[PDB]
Write a protein that binds this DNA or RNA. Sequence first.
RNA 1: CAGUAACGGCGAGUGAACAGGGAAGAGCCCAGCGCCGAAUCCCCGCCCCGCGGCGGGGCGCGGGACAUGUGGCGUACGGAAGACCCGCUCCCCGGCGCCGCUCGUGGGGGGCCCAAGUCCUUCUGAUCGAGGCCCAGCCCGUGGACGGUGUGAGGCCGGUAGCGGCCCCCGGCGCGCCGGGCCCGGGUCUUCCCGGAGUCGGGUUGCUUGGGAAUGCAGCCCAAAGCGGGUGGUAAACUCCAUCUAAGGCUAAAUACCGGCACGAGACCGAUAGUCAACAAGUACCGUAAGGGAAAGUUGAAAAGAACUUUGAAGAGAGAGUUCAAGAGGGCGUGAAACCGUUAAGAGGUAAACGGGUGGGGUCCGCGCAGUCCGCCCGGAGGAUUCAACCCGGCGGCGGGUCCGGCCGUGUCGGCGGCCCGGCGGAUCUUUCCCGCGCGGGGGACCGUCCCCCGACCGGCGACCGGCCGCCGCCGGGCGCAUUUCC
RNA 2: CCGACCCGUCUUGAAACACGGACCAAGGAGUCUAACACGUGCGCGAGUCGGGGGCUCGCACGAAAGCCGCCGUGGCGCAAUGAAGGUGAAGGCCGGCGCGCUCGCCGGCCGAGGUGGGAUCCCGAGGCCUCUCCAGUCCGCCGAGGGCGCACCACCGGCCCGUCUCGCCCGCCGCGCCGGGGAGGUGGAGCACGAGCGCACGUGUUAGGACCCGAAAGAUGGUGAACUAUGCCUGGGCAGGGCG
RNA 3: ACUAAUCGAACCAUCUAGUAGCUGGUUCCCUCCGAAGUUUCCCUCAGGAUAGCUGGCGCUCUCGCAGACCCGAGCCACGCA
RNA 4: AGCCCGGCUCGCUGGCGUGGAGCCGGGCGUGGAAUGCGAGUGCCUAGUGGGCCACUUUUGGUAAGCAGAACUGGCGCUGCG
RNA 5: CUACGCCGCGACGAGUAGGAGGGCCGCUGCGGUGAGCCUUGAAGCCUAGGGCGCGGGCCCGGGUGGAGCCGCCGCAGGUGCAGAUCUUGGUGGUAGUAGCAAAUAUUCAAACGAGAACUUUGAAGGCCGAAGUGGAGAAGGGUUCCAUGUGAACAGCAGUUGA
RNA 6: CGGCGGGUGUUGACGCGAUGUGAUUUCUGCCCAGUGCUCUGAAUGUCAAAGUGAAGAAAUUCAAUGAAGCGCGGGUAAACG
RNA 7: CCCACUGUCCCUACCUACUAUCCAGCGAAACCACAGCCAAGGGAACGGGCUUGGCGGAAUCAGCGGGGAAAGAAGACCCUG
RNA 8: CACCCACUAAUAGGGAACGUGAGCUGGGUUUAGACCGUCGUGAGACAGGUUAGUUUUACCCUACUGAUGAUGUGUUGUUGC
Lengths: 147, 210
Amino acid sequence: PSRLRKTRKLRGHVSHGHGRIGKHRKHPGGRGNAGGLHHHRINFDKYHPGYFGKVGMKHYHLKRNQSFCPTVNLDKLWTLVSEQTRVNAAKNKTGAAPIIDVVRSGYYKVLGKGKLPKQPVIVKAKFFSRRAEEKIKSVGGACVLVA
Amino acid sequence: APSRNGMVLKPHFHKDWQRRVATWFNQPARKIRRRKARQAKARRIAPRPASGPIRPIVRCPTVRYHTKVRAGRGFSLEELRVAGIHKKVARTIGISVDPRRRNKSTESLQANVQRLKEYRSKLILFPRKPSAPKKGDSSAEELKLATQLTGPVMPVRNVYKKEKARVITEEEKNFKAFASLRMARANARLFGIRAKRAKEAAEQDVEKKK
RNA sequence: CAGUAACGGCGAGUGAACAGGGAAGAGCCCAGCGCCGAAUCCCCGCCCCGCGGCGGGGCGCGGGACAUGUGGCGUACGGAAGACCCGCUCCCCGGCGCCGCUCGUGGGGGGCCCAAGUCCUUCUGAUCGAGGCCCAGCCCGUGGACGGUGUGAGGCCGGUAGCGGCCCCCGGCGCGCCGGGCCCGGGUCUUCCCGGAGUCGGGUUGCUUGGGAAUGCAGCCCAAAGCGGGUGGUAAACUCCAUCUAAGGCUAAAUACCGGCACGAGACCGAUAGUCAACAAGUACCGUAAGGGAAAGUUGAAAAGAACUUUGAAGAGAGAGUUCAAGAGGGCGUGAAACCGUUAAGAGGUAAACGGGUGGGGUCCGCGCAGUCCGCCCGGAGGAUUCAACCCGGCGGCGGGUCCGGCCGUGUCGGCGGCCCGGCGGAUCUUUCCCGCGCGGGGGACCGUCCCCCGACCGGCGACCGGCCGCCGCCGGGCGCAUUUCC
RNA sequence: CCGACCCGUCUUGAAACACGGACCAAGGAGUCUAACACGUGCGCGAGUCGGGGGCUCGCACGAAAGCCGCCGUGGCGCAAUGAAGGUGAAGGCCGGCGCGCUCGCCGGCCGAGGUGGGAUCCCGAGGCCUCUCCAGUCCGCCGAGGGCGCACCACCGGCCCGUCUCGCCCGCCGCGCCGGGGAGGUGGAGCACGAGCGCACGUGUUAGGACCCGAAAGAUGGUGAACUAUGCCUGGGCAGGGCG
RNA sequence: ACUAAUCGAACCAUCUAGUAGCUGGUUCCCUCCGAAGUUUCCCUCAGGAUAGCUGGCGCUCUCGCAGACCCGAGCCACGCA
RNA sequence: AGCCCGGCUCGCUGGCGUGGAGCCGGGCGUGGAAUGCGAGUGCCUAGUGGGCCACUUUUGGUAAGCAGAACUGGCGCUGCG
RNA sequence: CUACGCCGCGACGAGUAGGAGGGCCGCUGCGGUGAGCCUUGAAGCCUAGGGCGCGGGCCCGGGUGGAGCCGCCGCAGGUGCAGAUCUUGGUGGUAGUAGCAAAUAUUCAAACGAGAACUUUGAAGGCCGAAGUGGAGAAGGGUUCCAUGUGAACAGCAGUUGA
RNA sequence: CGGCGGGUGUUGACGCGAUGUGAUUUCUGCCCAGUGCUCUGAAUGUCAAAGUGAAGAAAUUCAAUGAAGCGCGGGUAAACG
RNA sequence: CCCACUGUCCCUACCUACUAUCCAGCGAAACCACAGCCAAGGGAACGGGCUUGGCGGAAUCAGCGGGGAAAGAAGACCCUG
RNA sequence: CACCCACUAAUAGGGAACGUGAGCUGGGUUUAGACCGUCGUGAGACAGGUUAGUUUUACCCUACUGAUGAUGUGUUGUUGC
Ligand SMILES: [Mg+2]
Ligand SMILES: [Mg+2]
Ligand SMILES: [Mg+2]
Ligand SMILES: [Mg+2]
Ligand SMILES: [Mg+2]
Ligand SMILES: [Mg+2]
Ligand SMILES: [Mg+2]
Ligand SMILES: [Mg+2]
Ligand SMILES: [Mg+2]
Ligand SMILES: [Mg+2]
Ligand SMILES: [Mg+2]
Ligand SMILES: [Mg+2]
Ligand SMILES: [Mg+2]
Ligand SMILES: [Mg+2]
Ligand SMILES: [Mg+2]
Ligand SMILES: [Mg+2]
Ligand SMILES: [Mg+2]
Ligand SMILES: [Mg+2]
Ligand SMILES: [Mg+2]
Ligand SMILES: [Mg+2]
Ligand SMILES: [Mg+2]
Ligand SMILES: [Mg+2]
Ligand SMILES: [Mg+2]
Ligand SMILES: [Mg+2]
Ligand SMILES: [Mg+2]
Ligand SMILES: [Mg+2]
Ligand SMILES: [Mg+2]
Ligand SMILES: [Mg+2]
Ligand SMILES: [Mg+2]
Ligand SMILES: [Mg+2]
Ligand SMILES: [Mg+2]
Ligand SMILES: [Mg+2]
Ligand SMILES: [Mg+2]
Ligand SMILES: [Mg+2]
Ligand SMILES: [Mg+2]
Ligand SMILES: [Mg+2]
Ligand SMILES: [Mg+2]
Ligand SMILES: [Mg+2]
Ligand SMILES: [Mg+2]
Ligand SMILES: [Mg+2]
Ligand SMILES: [Mg+2]
Ligand SMILES: [Mg+2]
Ligand SMILES: [Mg+2]
Ligand SMILES: [Mg+2]
Ligand SMILES: [Mg+2]
Ligand SMILES: [Mg+2]
Ligand SMILES: [Mg+2]
Ligand SMILES: [Mg+2]
Ligand SMILES: [Mg+2]
Ligand SMILES: [Mg+2]
Ligand SMILES: [Mg+2]
Ligand SMILES: [Mg+2]
Ligand SMILES: [Mg+2]
Ligand SMILES: [Mg+2]
Ligand SMILES: [Mg+2]
Ligand SMILES: [Mg+2]
Ligand SMILES: [Mg+2]
Ligand SMILES: [Mg+2]
Ligand SMILES: [Mg+2]
Ligand SMILES: [Mg+2]
Ligand SMILES: [Mg+2]
Ligand SMILES: [Mg+2]
Ligand SMILES: [Mg+2]
Ligand SMILES: [Mg+2]
Ligand SMILES: [Mg+2]
């Protein structure tokens, strides 16, 4: 809607909101990121530290698929199964524990953030964190690995 | 000229982009034309399936997707020769073939050959001369059971074999998954250098006493 | 994927690919090694069948190509030949007559047609305007898109709608026939055969690329191998593995389209706008040439385009006439401002013009010119149903232990009630009833939402509705005809 | 009668002897796309979004609208840190034991710690009532103090990743130049019961013609020796006297 | 000097709407608020970035909102200059 | 967020129950000068970055309607007597 | 009591560059709506007419004109001009002004004609003075050549004449 | 741009090509340090690619040899001066 | 520099032709914020306008060159980019 | 500016956009041509010398010079202040 814009309120004002002294000129100061080290150095230093230079090893032909390892925390772990599984395991008289396969859910690593409800469970994952393993063992569960 | 806080932006508009702009105003017309072509093809091949030849069971390559299975280009020649189908007859009866695909493992081979055998079981085949039924199929089951098949033939589905809840054994409880993974990484890293050091020690061992 | 990996005075900036999901989907052929009496091909004369894009067949002690290699089999997915066994599986080519009639309802092209007001009364220059058209309403409507017609029209006209009609031509799909070609496929075993060279690759140079100790391309030099060669994104040696098979060839679809032919549409522009060009526009005109390149739309419904009289040599006038209008008269719809002529009014020696305040004059406005109204009461002079109150009928508002139903919300019960005779789901358990190796797909049970259901309790009639009552209010009709009521 | 210099613009300063403007009509200059950032509105919400494709008499509108869900592939978010190999975010209280050695093994509970503020809310002694009382019945208001404390702020702890220092232990089908753990500092764009996604609008910045008009220039490809400059070919022309 | 009224590099078309820190212009009304020509860095001095000055959007609190006209019934707010 | 009482923790310190810091309870309101005012906090952001003048102080200059500084005010951005 | 409404009290009001809000200010088109307006006269334009609003502007009367137009709720812009030595078009003052002054020169009578300084005939006076103001060609022009007729426009006065 | 392409050249040192000074007369002195130009390679200093040899498992590293040029040595001013 | 020569001059005058001038016909352009009488003051430091005073009388003709910091060209000199 | 000759009463000093270029001239400075000296390797430079080098418009407003007229006395004229 051009009828709601500031141009419609600037009719009759000769400078169009850009000043009489400095005016509105084409490109004072350069085009784009001009002078990032010379006359716009303060802005780049103040708001973009680390912008200039090389750090680290360069690796040609990076394949993002090779390092694909999505993660799931322990507090969200029980959401990967239906609540029917949870209540069946919780109210179960025997010591039977359900098996949660996070790879089926699309997660490869089990991270250890959060806490678990105190009931045993078997977790099928490609990778486990140390604290995630400790928390699963503490509730009587077990961790198994898949490839 | 930068102004206060703000993201450093790199527009790729320095290369006279206005002469090469693709507008999509023909997108609805293109969809209509594609739908008309689809309907025309489906009417052209009257009893044959609309989508076309049956496609094989195919696991996706990389480590990101190898849990997922999809449809492939065509059945491998090994699948055809163990399913009893000639590789030149298969394309005549709606079986896509792929001469350049190998079968690295037997499980996928068995899955694809069971797919082929079940498809051959479901196939209705018309004789070349309708008045002279030679060896194709019986007229009773091809009169009113012959239907245009919509969608992909025998669609590929991800099946998840459910495993039931079980009482956790002690040897699962004593398993050390983090330690096992760390030591597996260490062994994979240090395998070659360990072999070289063992070989060096063996070379020093066979000349120590002299 | 991704503005990512990477490139970049690592500055400005640049910048892919794999995998994934889709649109479409189609595969093949030589050379070479071979085998087969060159099996092969072109041209020309004669005859037959044809013409319609010039072919089919037969004949030639008729020419030529070709052993410096034609054709059949055969191609990396292996192939060939012998044996053994199994299966006869039926191809493509162009016409003869016709059906389905080709098909989202014709397959295409062309042509000619198909509903209903010019009804009554009026406006107008003309009307397509306005009012009406008893039957629930002028008529048709599968047609109320559009355009024309003296306005503004579904019914005046052309069209529009319609798996509407008729006629002509053209093309591809099945059957029996026609002329002839048409030649064995699969599985097992044995015996053989297997590949593209100034090319790959290496050095160097130059360009290019995201390709970074060099991605690709090219020049020059060197110059290959056959358990070989290429690639495996950091140069090199050793070693294992993976993957493909280069230096020969073809291939539809998805895809692009500011030129062309023919169409449809638009929240676009509306004659200084929109193409330069709405018009005898790439025209007039300019430059030696390359080339540059405009301006310019509108009388009126219909020319009905001003007969005729008169002045002037004529241009041009005054009359007359047409028209609804020439205060529309051939660049003529409307006709602004700048500027000019005349008329009227006012003023004028500090250039005009301006802000504030008054005064005078003038054009107009006030239906101005005997100045508002209207509620009650009082008084007078006149009318009139009827005023109040009761009766009958109708309808509304409010209330009622729900008086009676219909119910409604939350739960609460046994679930007779649904996997046959109710669903939808579940990362819940199972044949230990059922078809795929001790290895699935079914069918079951369970759970959760539930589906309407049988009733009852709970709070209520709610803004979800009815019937009864009781009250109130209103209206219509009676009676009430005078100290009432109203005018 | 009083007041009254011509506007626009640049400028410390314009009525200026500063520039533009004779008059009138029409045209005439912050736009669109892309990418951010913040604010606001809307929907859903640890999710969100079909935008590409497909399915619906194919088409008056409709190139619209509707739907897909085993089309959510994928994007953004839900996890950070390191150059990288990689690693990757829960503690408090009551206990019995070593030796409760600044710590090693379990129980039971609780479920992201504490301090100072902290809107709001809660309890609340005591008060306010009438024709009066000795007598208590139901609810309202004011109320000193007290309590739970939202968001948010300051602080002190705690947890994850990198890097130092110190030191002691544990694990095993590989007994290793193996793996793991602790305490104390420090580096992070972190955690510490999510807040994001989509769409619209506004403002600001940037790349694009980029608010409009403006160079001297540079490059590519063509046209000119009808004027002039030079060479060549072929033509034409230049009274009358003087010196000698 | 001359090279078609053009010569210290002709003319035509295109790249090209070339770039410009420089000049000129930049279109309706009312209301509210309302500056700076200073610090630091820059081949910077006719310009930018930066802090400062400005506006807008808010948000977190503070005294209470007193009696329906009447009428308070030592102690009178966080905090700021 | 002050003062005063107790008590607890420390691996820092150390003749010492020492010192220092931190923590946990309690009691103190005459709110510990005047005057005025309601405060705190966050995001986005334009224009500007040529200035000039005056009292006083003041540097160079013979001086300047010159050039350069400090403080306040004004003009710029401001009409009116 | 259009709660986006109405009412009360107090204080205050400068403003460039700049920022924000409101606009029942204005232009154009679209979706809605007004059983809107209009040939018994729309848009547009003119007006010493009557008013409204602080203002942007708006309504009504009169005339002209001859077929379309507007209000409200939303939507969308190629949306408002005094300037830019602005673009295009038109018009003024200058102004009946500069000027119609290079190469000696015209005069009389007559004819045609509405009209004669300029046409034509006759007479007179002159100039070019054979290196011409003569007679013919090349280049270039392209019908200007010739005859008749016209007096619109052109021949910078006129014209009965003319390329 | 290119071709054993083309101009001088249908030419041959009394000719082409490149310069300075500017008829005649009379003269044209000194400087080869500098910068140019040019002659000589004399053992010869430095010197690229290719080639040669050595170390290495290879990339590679090192070494040896040494074309013009530059240095080294003459000449030249009616060459700049 | 000398002789001669003359209006170059003392020191100007007179004459001739074409204009200019007036008339009939025809008929532009430059330029133009508005315009046009001065002195002084102040002021962007040399006013046509403002302040104070001097004053101010229609419409014009032929000349004129003091002013309009007259017109003509976005200063070509200087500086900046 | 200076200096000299001669006369003279005296041969005083200054302003008016260093008066006066739409009044003139163009000798000088101060474009492009060219020569010399100095500087520079060179292009080229020289408040160093020399020579040749386009001086445009008024018809507008005012000012001024003249020329008609205008206001008022009824018209008109003479003589006058
Ligand atoms: Mg303003
Ligand atoms: Mg500035
Ligand atoms: Mg991304
Ligand atoms: Mg590139
Ligand atoms: Mg597909
Ligand atoms: Mg062969
Ligand atoms: Mg019509
Ligand atoms: Mg119609
Ligand atoms: Mg009809
Ligand atoms: Mg039809
Ligand atoms: Mg490598
Ligand atoms: Mg028009
Ligand atoms: Mg046009
Ligand atoms: Mg010409
Ligand atoms: Mg005439
Ligand atoms: Mg009319
Ligand atoms: Mg007209
Ligand atoms: Mg200016
Ligand atoms: Mg100045
Ligand atoms: Mg001004
Ligand atoms: Mg002045
Ligand atoms: Mg000037
Ligand atoms: Mg200027
Ligand atoms: Mg001007
Ligand atoms: Mg102008
Ligand atoms: Mg306009
Ligand atoms: Mg859609
Ligand atoms: Mg995904
Ligand atoms: Mg707290
Ligand atoms: Mg902390
Ligand atoms: Mg920003
Ligand atoms: Mg521009
Ligand atoms: Mg330009
Ligand atoms: Mg250049
Ligand atoms: Mg010539
Ligand atoms: Mg620098
Ligand atoms: Mg400036
Ligand atoms: Mg100063
Ligand atoms: Mg200023
Ligand atoms: Mg101020
Ligand atoms: Mg002031
Ligand atoms: Mg104000
Ligand atoms: Mg515009
Ligand atoms: Mg204008
Ligand atoms: Mg303006
Ligand atoms: Mg004249
Ligand atoms: Mg004349
Ligand atoms: Mg003569
Ligand atoms: Mg002649
Ligand atoms: Mg004439
Ligand atoms: Mg003639
Ligand atoms: Mg010579
Ligand atoms: Mg000499
Ligand atoms: Mg040498
Ligand atoms: Mg010598
Ligand atoms: Mg004066
Ligand atoms: Mg200039
Ligand atoms: Mg200039
Ligand atoms: Mg002077
Ligand atoms: Mg003068
Ligand atoms: Mg002059
Ligand atoms: Mg001179
Ligand atoms: Mg000169
Ligand atoms: Mg000369
Ligand atoms: Mg005159």
